[PDB]
Design a binder for these strands. Sequence first.
DNA 1: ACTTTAT
DNA 2: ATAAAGTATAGTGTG
Length: 192
Amino acid sequence: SYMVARMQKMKAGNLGGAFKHNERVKDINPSRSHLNYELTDRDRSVSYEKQIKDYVNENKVSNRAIRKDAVLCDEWIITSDKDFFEKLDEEQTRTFFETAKNYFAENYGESNIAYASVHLDESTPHMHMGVVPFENGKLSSKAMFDREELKHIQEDLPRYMSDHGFELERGKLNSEAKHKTVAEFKRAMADM
DNA sequence: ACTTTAT
DNA sequence: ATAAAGTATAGTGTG
Ligand SMILES: [Cl-]
Ligand SMILES: [Mg+2]
Ligand SMILES: [Mn+2]
Ligand code: NA
């Protein structure tokens, strides 16, 4: 079965709306809303925008103030096909998502992992994990998540997952498939 | 590459 | 004036 991993570039403007989904202030049921779990040691009340800025500001090497259009984090999505989460119990659910969080902690840094919101109230159990691209005193997604790196991630991470009792396969190498938005993909299934 | 941002 | 970092990527499926 296919291992699904995809980041989206997250700036201050769109971090408003991304935080506004990740915690609740219409494809969801409120009956399943609880039980959902956060996988970092972050303060529930504090927003991502405030957490990350201050984490960078205090840790950044250069004195040049943070640019307005900066990539503050990269909300990676970890999920798979529905046949995968069926053969998984409730405590193996936690074990699956924690190895995902770990891969990005082992290769890209521990306190870089700003959040890890797990959603069980949508169609598939999926984690929204936001990785801050802070390395060598620099904040750059351009330098951390480049062309070379995402090819490695698509190769290495599923093979890392297969070292932990889970049975997956990497997505089709050198794919030609273009990302369809949730609204687009829904419509892409309205006709067949 | 080429362009936008903060020195 | 300078220069690090913005744009993309890579992958699947009801994010
Ligand atoms: Cl649902
Ligand atoms: Mg047809
Ligand atoms: Mn969600
Ligand atoms: Na390609």
